[PDB]
Write a protein that binds this DNA or RNA. Structure first.
Lengths: 100, 104
RNA sequence: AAAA
């Protein structure tokens, strides 16, 4: 109720975008229901929210080919590469254009 | 462009980074990661992009836990393989730990 | 709290 996920399918990743309605407390990490994804595709995590929410979510998709964190300045920065891409690679995605 | 300060405690290693100027994602290919005592959890702290924080949290996932410093709260546990649970907050004040300047 |  403080938080909601939009899950968008793309060829090479699933986009997971969160929207925080009101300021969250860390106790929420114990209660959050994470979106299920196609585990054969990497994940791009997007949203305006605390660094600890991002780190929590990135860890929760570590079992996928890669995890990329959305930077509105750049695209999605690969922060974990298990089976695909390299850390520091940028995926050319504009999340604002998908959501608008 | 970015340097590390390693602060050894009994309960955790505090890794604090400092950025001299804006970094580019390419830096993640070049960064040398401080080695830690892997039998103690890690607290990550610093002023930098969310992707840097996520990159560092994953690089210390082989330790008992990874906590991310929030100046409003303390160190929020984002990963645990210890008594600590995700969403637990470690009472640290990094601003006070760093007073007087730490060599990076 | 998308460069705590």
């Amino acid at each position: 109720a403080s938080m909601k996920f939009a899950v968008i399918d793309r060829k090479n990743f699933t986009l997971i975008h969160f929207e925080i309605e009101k300021p969250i407390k860390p106790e929420i990490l114990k209660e959050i229901e994470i979106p299920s994804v196609d585990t054969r595709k990497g994940v791009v995590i997007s949203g305006r929210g605390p660094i600890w929410l991002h780190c929590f979510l990135a860890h929760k998709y570590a079992h996928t080919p890669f995890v990329a964190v959305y930077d509105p300045r750049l695209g999605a920065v690969v922060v974990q590469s298990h089976s695909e891409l390299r850390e520091g690679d940028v995926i050319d995605v504009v999340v604002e254009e998908i959501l608008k």
